[PDB]
Amino acid sequence: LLSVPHTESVSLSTGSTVTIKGRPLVCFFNEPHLQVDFHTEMKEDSDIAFHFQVYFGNRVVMNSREFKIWKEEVESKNMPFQDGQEFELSILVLEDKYQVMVNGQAYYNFNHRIPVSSVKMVQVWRDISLTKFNVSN
């Protein structure tokens, strides 16, 4: 297992992929969460270019935190995750948006609000175990 909360320095550009493999810690019935935050600095309270929060079995919430303020919330009811199963997230950094694949198919998209070049850290946390975290070279 990798450390959770998991915090890493990153550098991203168009064409980068952030791969995350993990497993929910508890039954979906109890709504475990997963959160992935693309931050502008190493500090945890720094701004967030992409906030991706899964309410397993319920919904997905996406947003940005700009100058310490949460902006317009984006919601999805797509729930391709499977109770108890390991999942593989691939967050593709496209020219216009982040695209979040689950097990190789895109389910969530978030247009860039902050330039991708401002992202310097990614934190993965909440109710998962983590077996892989990789930023493409």
Add this chain to the structure above:
Amino acid sequence: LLSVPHTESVSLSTGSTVTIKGRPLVCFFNEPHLQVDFHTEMKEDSDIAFHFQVYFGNRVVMNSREFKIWKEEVESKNMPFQDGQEFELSILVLEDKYQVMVNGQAYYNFNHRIPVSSVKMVQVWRDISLTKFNVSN
């Protein structure tokens, strides 16, 4: 550190105290959560006589899950928890309600919806480290 998610068999009656000492895993600014669920059986998807969920720095939500259905949600804006600090929760089982103390003072109350004698398990989970879990004898 104790295991988180933390799941224990319990037996409660009027006068029992459930003591929980722990620390949030991340900055309050990012809204770590704490959840404490008093269950009717050892299985995680069993009914919940008392669901206590702290959205650190934001609010507290309380409810019951009866025959697999969430009931009427109770909210509190009391937020005595301190960013980064260890806290001590004491959940007192009173005749009429659960009373949740934080560092020795009561801030939250939840009238019994299920008999206390139906509780057989307590689970403590989400974004905390756990150093103490004790049910009074």
